[model samples]
Target: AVTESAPNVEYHDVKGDMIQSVTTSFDDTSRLLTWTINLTPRQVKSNLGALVSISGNQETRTVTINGKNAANGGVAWNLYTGESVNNNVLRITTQVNDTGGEVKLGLRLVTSDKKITKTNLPLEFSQVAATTNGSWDKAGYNTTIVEKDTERPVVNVPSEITVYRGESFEYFATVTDNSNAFDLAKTVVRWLYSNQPGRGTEWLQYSVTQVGNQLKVRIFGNVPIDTTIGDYTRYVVATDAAGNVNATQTEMGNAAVDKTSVNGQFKLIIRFRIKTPENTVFVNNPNQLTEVEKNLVREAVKKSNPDLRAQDVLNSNYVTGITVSNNGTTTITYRDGRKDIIDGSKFIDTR
Candidate 1:
């Protein structure tokens, strides 16, 4: 009745899978992850010889190699998970008091050759769903949890579009995530422009609406009539509830379009809805001209007909055409069949 209560110690006769079960728990206070393991020796390897090496992350405590032993029948085996603090890496080096049937099988042979029963692995960290790998050969398993959703949420925006002043254009792009819930609130959209090195740039206005899995991006393709006319980099990014971004991130932030690369961003051009005729001079605003200048412009017409007098001719409805040119010439044409010019370029100066 007293013959080897743990009859399974004679494991060299069977295949080696030394790691019995692996359990993981986290301590929020310590910010350190603790692992509980139950091991059974197999082949020539002892229970404690199964060392598991994990991928490097921001998780680690210190380089404490102090190990304690656990004894059963054949030999005492102990769990010693010592991390190298220099790199925050998870390394395992087991200790087995191999005396009789318990032989030295080495860490690689015992850990890799032996299959493990893994439980509650830590696969998520930070705001994002991240993954870490635990490497051991024969007893190991390489798996990616689909529910973890390591895939990033992608927002598709147009590569290029041309928009005119006072015009609205709609862009429909699909937002995709590996999981069901897609949050539009995490979307990043900006209209960035720097026309010249020493100058302040442009601004674009946009609104986002969603139906099902699509983003309806309504944008004012052009700036205000007086704004710059050049390419504006439209930076658009979307993140899923799992914190996956449409594009790769920068050091502390997400990626930008900035007139290059694909995904999450694009370029837009500005054009005048109506083309200006050749040899025509342009002014920002005609309202800048004064009433005295308008009366003088009408007086220069020298109208003998009272209907075409200074006041009536100067009336907005009575004025047919107003054009300005260099050499400081202001040309005015009246609906009452009269043409006139004024050196009113002084009051209205684009000189």
Candidate 2:
């Protein structure tokens, strides 16, 4: 049985002093923070509820609502930015979920900060009681703070993957923490290359999002054309809110950062190989041709001589050998060793 309640939820002003409100309740499951106040029907009818400005403070941490920055001036100065008014009650809502069956809310009011003190507001304001010239009620509210997280998160990347050069590739991983709660804005999931000289320097990092317990990572684009075709080892790394890293602790060798920590890190090395057409190998090395160029060459050979198959253009000893030069020139090498060079640009539109 896990408790999902915060021991305290206090509110404060723009500065740093505790204040009290009428009442407040934070629901962990729903991730809603509600502040309620009772006023006469006439008070609400006259729009007196608009005179109050709710303040929420997380002294040690910043709270976000639905991925939006809601805290400024040292507190969430207004928790009801787009709230709708009800009958005789004023309610404000916030999205703050629990971590590891526990929620911490800083919910006390403070009178010391002039930045948050409302002087021109009506006497019925909630923070008015915490104001300089108004009354004080210390027993009216509670607050919470984040606790140190020691639980390590888990990451599961694909065991093996094969992709073609210039083709789109997607990588995926599942990340989960013991609390089932995560500050995604603060978490980092990366796709790294292993056996590279510079260690951490030679890798691709992606911005990840948390969908339940899974993380979808796109490993497309940004792959240099000169990237070699081989069995490369790639891995995944996940960093949690507590600044813990999950990766292999292999000695840095000669990387700028010589120290490595595998405390909360997870590594999954994958083999990235270049894709080529079936039974086809370019004579001058097939890698020289881009995916599009390769397709163009195959089509040109097949269309120019209908009897020869596309693979014939890839096999050096076959009837047709299509090779591309660095300057985008296409050459046809026949079995008799006779070479025919054509403008790479002309191959763009195969006849």
Candidate 3:
């Protein structure tokens, strides 16, 4: 049912004068459009009845009820307006059957007065997955209201965010309606975990030094090299003047970005591989070298630096290389066809 209001806020339970106008198409033959409405004790004290109407395929019907039960002493008309429409015209109209029972209807009226109480009302807005660049302005009023709350107007994070362990990622958020460029300098941005936001457990903070239509702030959270691998979530929130702020989540596994979302919530995921000294070492020796007459010569150049250039590798040359002879003596080949013999006792481990 559509709500009636003048520039009304989002639909939330509040008053009793509300009329719900709903249009639903049925595919099955039998469907019960149950009206599960709750009323407060005070609303029960007031003598009020709800009006229900069903219309479909050019046919209209109405039902009124005074709370009554069947011969078995059970509340049979808890479902007061019960009518079956043929396949040609099928729909049910129901409202507060207030004639006999003391009940209130509409958006779950908890108070006799129209004033909406926080605890009495249910959640109004549903979580959304609009985390991207083009999707920011989709909510004209949400954006406008957010801009009024914060000087910084920034869209949520985009999808597909990633970061390597020990690496960092950065992004920008726009704080709208900021007249002054320097106002960005006063803005503060922070990365927040989804659950424990109050404690400073897994969060990073940054201040904006540059301001355009958007504010530039850096966000960096490192997965330690020894950290365990798995899925994780995080978020980035930027606040500007006017106390307005916006947040976005990263939607990648083992990694995260300041501009992304996942699972309909604006959040980030961090995926990483933790490498320790022992775990990184295997058949490969820490130092890639070979023993020549107790003199070490580096061989496995790629072991020290995976990106080592070809030129960095040492060239194996027998002439300048030291060799142990069968006579328990060391012989060194000279580049100029000269040879020097030394006692094996003089050889030492020099890498």
Residue 238 local lDDT, model 2? 54
Model 1 lDDT tens row, 234-300:
5566767556776644511333424246476676665434322223222344546444444434334
- Which whole-number lDDT from 0 to 100 does residue 107 have in model 2? 32
How far does residue 257 in candidate 3 sit from its true spot (Å)? Answer: 21
lDDT of each: 0.39, 0.39, 0.30
Q: Clash pairs of candidate 1? A: 11-43, 17-114, 112-137, 112-138, 114-139, 115-139
Could you list the CA RMSD of all candidates, in the order they appear?
Answer: 18.3, 16.6, 21.4
What does candidate 3 score on TM? Answer: 0.26
Candidate 2 differs from the real structure by a C-alpha RMSD in angstroms, to one decimal, of: 16.6
- Cα lDDT of candidate 3 equals 0.30
Collision count of model 1: 6
Of 1 and 2, the candidate ahead on TM-score is 2
The numbered model that scores best in TM-score is: 2
